[PDB]
Amino acid sequence: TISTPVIIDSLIRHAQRTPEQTALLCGDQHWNYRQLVTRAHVMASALRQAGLSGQAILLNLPKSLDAVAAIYATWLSGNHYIPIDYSQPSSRIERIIAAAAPALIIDTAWLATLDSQVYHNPIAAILYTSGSTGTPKGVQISHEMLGFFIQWAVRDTQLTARDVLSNHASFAFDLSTFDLFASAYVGAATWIIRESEQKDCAALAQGLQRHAVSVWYSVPSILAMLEKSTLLNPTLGQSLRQVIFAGEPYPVTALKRLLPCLPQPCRVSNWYGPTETNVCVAYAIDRARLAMLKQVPIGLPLEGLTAQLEDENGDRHPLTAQLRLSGELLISGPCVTPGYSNVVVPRQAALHPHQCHATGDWVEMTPEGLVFRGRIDDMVKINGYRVELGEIESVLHQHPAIDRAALCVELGDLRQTLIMVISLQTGAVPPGLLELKQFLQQKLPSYMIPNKLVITESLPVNAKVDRKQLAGVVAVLE
Amino acid sequence: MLESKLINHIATQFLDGEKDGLDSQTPLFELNIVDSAAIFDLVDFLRQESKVSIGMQEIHPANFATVQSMVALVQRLKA
Ligand SMILES: *P(=O)(=O)O[C]C([C])([C])[C]([O])C(=O)[N][C][C]C(=O)[N][C][C]S[C]([C]S(=O)(=O)[N][C][C]1O[C](N2[C]=NC3=C([N])N=[C]N=C32)[C]([O])[C]1[O])[C]1[C][C][C][N]1
Numbered sequence A: 001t002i003s004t005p006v007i008i009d010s011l012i013r014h015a016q017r018t019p020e021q022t023a024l025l026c027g028d029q030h031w032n033y034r035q036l037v038t039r040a041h042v043m044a045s046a047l048r049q050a051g052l053s054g055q056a057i058l059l060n061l062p063k064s065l066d067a068v069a070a071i072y073a074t075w076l077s078g079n080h081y082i083p084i085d086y087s088q089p090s091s092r093i094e095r096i097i098a099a100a101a102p103a104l105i106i107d108t109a110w111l112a113t114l115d116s117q118v119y120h121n122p123i124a125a126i127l128y129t130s131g132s133t134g135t136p137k138g139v140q141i142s143h144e145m146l147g148f149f150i151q152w153a154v155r156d157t158q159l160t161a162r163d164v165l166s167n168h169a170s171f172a173f174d175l176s177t178f179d180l181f182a183s184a185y186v187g188a189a190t191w192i193i194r195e196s197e198q199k200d201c202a203a204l205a206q207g208l209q210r211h212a213v214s215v216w217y218s219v220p221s222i223l224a225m226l227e228k229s230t231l232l233n234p235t236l237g238q239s240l241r242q243v244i245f246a247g248e249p250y251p252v253t254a255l256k257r258l259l260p261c262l263p264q265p266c267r268v269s270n271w272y273g274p275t276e277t278n279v280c281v282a283y284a285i286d287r288a289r290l291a292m293l294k295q296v297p298i299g300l301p302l303e304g305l306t307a308q309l310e311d312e313n314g315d316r317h318p319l320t321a322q323l324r325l326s327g328e329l330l331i332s333g334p335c336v337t338p339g340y341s342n343v344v345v346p347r348q349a350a351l352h353p354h355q356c357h358a359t360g361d362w363v364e365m366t367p368e369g370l371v372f373r374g375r376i377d378d379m380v381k382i383n384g385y386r387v388e389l390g391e392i393e394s395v396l397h398q399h400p401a402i403d404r405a406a407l408c409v410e411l412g413d414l415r416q417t418l419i420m421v422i423s424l425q426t427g428a429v430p431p432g433l434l435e436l437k438q439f440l441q442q443k444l445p446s447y448m449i450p451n452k453l454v455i456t457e458s459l460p461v462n463a464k465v466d467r468k469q470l471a472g473v474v475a476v477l478e
Numbered sequence B: 001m002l003e004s005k006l007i008n009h010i011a012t013q014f015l016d017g018e019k020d021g022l023d024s025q026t027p028l029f030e031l032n033i034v035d036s037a038a039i040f041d042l043v044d045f046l047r048q049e050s051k052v053s054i055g056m057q058e059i060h061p062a063n064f065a066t067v068q069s070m071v072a073l074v075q076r077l078k079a
């Protein structure tokens, strides 16, 4: 019903042709291609024996060699994987499991139990993101989507078997699709960065050097941390030939501090897109042009995709080199999710089945390509993490003291500030800022915990909160 | 004196002056009082006020999780 996924065919060929080539590094451990593929086959056999076919398999695992083997094992058994960020609170992983309704959860215990003993499915994975109602929102990722992205990304970066790729992001996020799958496509090695290492600038710098990392893909926020650490320099990083940032803008002031930390000949790229498209717009930085740029362009749509800008009138303008207009970016082509797995989002419902996604990003077409201007809804990027303000609101409305709650945001250069505006129940003890942070700490990951509180007698509402009015009530009350 | 300087710095720089509920055991990063990306701003304050060298090549970042841990680290560096 589908072609064999190109990533699985490539992985099997590398285990056959170069069995002893390193596939994966994690802590002090490494696997060659034979060990990875053999382990994936052992796990696939167990899923086959459990009679799982065409099902969601949720990977409740830390970043590890075994978690990568489980990804491939789902595909080899006709199943799709549900990755999660193992660093977040257990109560949110429970909400994802409830939303995903997986046929099977692979956890540490399942691996322990295991060790003591015709492709019909078009879907490769479902990535559950922040949902505006609080309910996690599943983005279906097809084999077709991953193949399209990986073949484009290998060509763009000239990736080969000699490369050593970092894997910074959690498997829950689509950056990991390049780090793992582009590596497997070409027969390269990937360094799986563990949860304890993801923020640790000394451990990252030491690993870049130890493993001779040649290709790095992350959000700007960790690259700007590595710059500020003073630990990243062109000698420690001499193996780096490609750095890729994505997920949020890299302010040009900060990006000019990073470049002297990297080898001069290192290619630096800006990659753009939401989970629903993976990377769909890309720009390779010209260090000569960079001094004159006020913003780094996100660039041009990938070969094989098309774009439109939807103006303030709702009219869709086809993207051309000559267009000089700001509007909402709409992307079309094989990158686009077939749709959300578990919720209806009416804005996308007559777009996704026509291979179109409305990004929610306001963008400008310029002589240097597309430039990101801002979001137009209530989804915000916090250090490159996807946050629906409605998710945080849904949790705050459960606090015993709260009547109504709404968030607003202040944006700066590599900084965002979430502000909670709440009204209280009659007779309720007003919670303090630290009390509400402690309330949220059990429920949401740290980057969704707001850092300002404003208590008002009443939240502005319509015949739903009027968000236009929040900055003003914050101003008056401050 | 260092513990008090650090409590006042976090109250002033990160919490608009309010010490309400802030103490030496408050987990600064877990409660998003200090952005994970702003750790080097704390390191800089600590190095300046403590008058000990703090090389991030050799010093675990967990040492910045609380005021108590920052104070414990400076005690170890002052041999
Ligand atoms: P602390 O905060 O505890 O620690 C700091 C640290 C370690 C850096 C931490 O914050 C961290 O690891 N953060 C990274 C989180 C992460 O890995 N995110 C990856 C996903 S980003 C994106 C998918 S999305 O749907 O989540 N976002 C889409 C959305 O983002 C904006 N956007 C994307 N790309 C750009 C670019 N190039 N320029 C500006 N904005 C951009 C848009 O608003 C878009 O709609 C990935 C990115 C590539 C493919 N999808």
Ligand SMILES: [Mg+2]
Pocket (backbone or CB within 6 Å): A127, A172, A173, A174, A175, A274, A275
């Ligand atoms: Mg993602």
